[PDB]
């Protein structure tokens, strides 16, 4: 595998180069992703038991 890069875009002013997600955008992404993953793991544990 090769270190992955995602979500960059080229600004109209070449001097600014490639723009990338800020720390706020990345934080929003992580908080949004963590919730369903943690809930799914909790539910899955219970389903193992309710089977």
């Amino acid at each position: 595998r090769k270190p992955p890069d995602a979500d960059g875009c080229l600004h109209a002013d070449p001097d600014l180069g490639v723009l990338c997600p800020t720390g706020c955008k990345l934080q929003d992404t992580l908080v949004r992703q963590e919730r369903p993953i943690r809930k799914s793991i909790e539910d899955l544990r219970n389903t193992v038991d309710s089977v």
Binding site: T22, C24, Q27, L30, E34, L44, V48
Partner: protein, 47 residues
């Protein structure tokens, strides 16, 4: 919100403040390690 009292380097002319990507990388490591442990537990049970 960032204020002079909770953010010692604050200069609002520079805009709103956000975590740095170092904070993002450190959060990701904590999250990834934690969730992976729980997934390994379930993988041991169902496989």
């Amino acid at each position: 919100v960032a204020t002079r009292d909770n953010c010692c380097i604050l200069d609002e002319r520079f805009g709103s403040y956000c975590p740095t990507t170092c904070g993002i990388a450190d959060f990701l490591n904590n999250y990834q390690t934690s969730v992976d442990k729980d997934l390994r537990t379930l993988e041991g049970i169902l496989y």
